[PDB]
Amino acid sequence: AKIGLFYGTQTGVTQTIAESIQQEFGGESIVDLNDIANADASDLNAYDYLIIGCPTWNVGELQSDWEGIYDDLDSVNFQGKKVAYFGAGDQVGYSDNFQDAMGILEEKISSLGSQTVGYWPIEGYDFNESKAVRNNQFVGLAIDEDNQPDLTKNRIKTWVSQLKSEFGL
Numbered sequence: 016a017k018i019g020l021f022y023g024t025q026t027g028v029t030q031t032i033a034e035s036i037q038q039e040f041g042g043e044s045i046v047d048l049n050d051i052a053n054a055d056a057s058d059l060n061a062y063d064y065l066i067i068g069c070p071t072w073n074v075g076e077l078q079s080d081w082e083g084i085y086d087d088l089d090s091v092n093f094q095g096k097k098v099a100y101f102g103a104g105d106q107v108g109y110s111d112n113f114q115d116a117m118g119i120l121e122e123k124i125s126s127l128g129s130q131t132v133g134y135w136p137i138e139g140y141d142f143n144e145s146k147a148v149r150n151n152q153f154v155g156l157a158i159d160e161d162n163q164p165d166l167t168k169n170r171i172k173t174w175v176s177q178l179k180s181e182f183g184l
């Protein structure tokens with residue numbers, strides 16, 4: 016597989032999303048699925064295409080496994096990689112920090128030389144602030160299983176379909 020997906024999760028939602036994205040891409044032969052709790056930052060070097068999934072916890076913080084590796088990301092060579100992101104969040108409970116983690120990771124990784132692809136429009140959501148917004152789009156797939164579970168399936172399907180192109184699929 017030429018695409019590597021690395022996710023982190025506290026309660027399992029992000030994992031489930033990760034599994035669905037893998038299946039939408041076409042399976043294990045298309046995307047390698049990895050829990051970041053088991054990886055080294057160095058594992059990220061193998062791929063030209065990455066998908067980073069991370070939920071936001073504790074009012075605007077990264078999920079703990081991502082927080083653990085955060086400082087090691089500098090050691091990865093992201094030059095030339097295309098990276099797409101996804102995150103789980105709750106726009107009602109955390110309106111002022113909706114999907115911040117996705118935003119924090121994207122800012123770090125993009126600054127290291129990768130190109131973000133996979134922007135997602137903000138129509139259909141309601142939140143006050145987010146670190147993951149740029150030019151009025153999310154930098155990646157914003158999922159909200161707490162408030163909008165009925166939208167998830169479609170959001171994933173649409174997003175993957177847009178991604179396919181950018182990943183040379």
Ligand SMILES: Cc1cc2nc3c(=O)[nH]c(=O)nc-3n(C[C@H](O)[C@H](O)[C@H](O)COP(=O)(O)O)c2cc1C
Pocket residue numbers: 023024025026027028029030070071072073074075076078103104105106109112113114115160161
């Ligand atoms: C105590 C607590 C704090 C949270 N903080 C945030 C937050 O700052 N921003 C946000 O978008 N969602 C926040 N969430 C919502 C979660 O990210 C969300 O429930 C997600 O589905 C959890 O994903 P996981 O199972 O992969 O960890 C919080 C949830 C809890 C329970």
